[PDB]
């Protein structure tokens, strides 16, 4: 009943969201930082390949590895495909205003085809056509 983070969660549970955003931000982020540091520390001491490990170590690693997974912004990370295939201050973009809002004038007058949320939409030879898992699963089987 004296740990800095063990009272933070309790006081958040009791008081609730009656305070401003920053206090809730810090109170939630403390435990996240602690968890990431612990998991990274355990992972460092390990080996890489799974053919050189015992049973208990393999189970521990496979259980605790998954907390580093990310799902939403993979494409932005991976776009850096351009090097494998070949061999911007918002204003130059079309369909986006300076305040990161949609520009209706161009999209309604000039008949803009698509909106370049990210780079690589200018010109483009990397394709990357959207798919559906179930169609592929039926196709294979």
């Amino acid at each position: 009943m004296c740990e800095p983070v063990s009272i933070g969660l309790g006081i958040m549970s009791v008081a609730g969201a009656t305070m401003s955003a920053s206090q809730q931000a810090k109170a939630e982020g403390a435990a996240i930082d602690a968890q990431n540091r612990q998991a990274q520390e355990m992972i460092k001491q390990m080996n890489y390949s799974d053919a050189n490990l015992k049973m208990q170590e393999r189970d521990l690693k496979e259980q605790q590895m998954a907390e580093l997974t990310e799902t939403t912004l993979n494409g932005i990370r991976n776009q850096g495909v351009r090097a494998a295939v070949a061999e911007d201050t918002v204003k130059e973009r079309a369909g986006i205003t300076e305040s990161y809002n949609r520009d209706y004038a161009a999209i309604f007058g000039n008949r803009i085809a698509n909106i370049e949320n990210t780079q690589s939409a200018i010109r483009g030879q990397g394709k990357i056509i959207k798919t559906s898992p179930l169609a592929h699963a039926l196709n294979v089987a």
């Binding site: 912004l73 494409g75 999209i107 803009i112 085809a113 909106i115 370049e116 949320n117 690589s120 939409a121």
Partner: peptide, 17 residues
């Protein structure tokens, strides 16, 4: 609720008149 998030798109297609 919130079954699964929606991945961010590279670029999006629209239409006009």
């Amino acid at each position: 609720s919130v079954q699964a998030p929606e991945p961010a798109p590279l670029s999006e297609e629209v239409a006009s008149v």
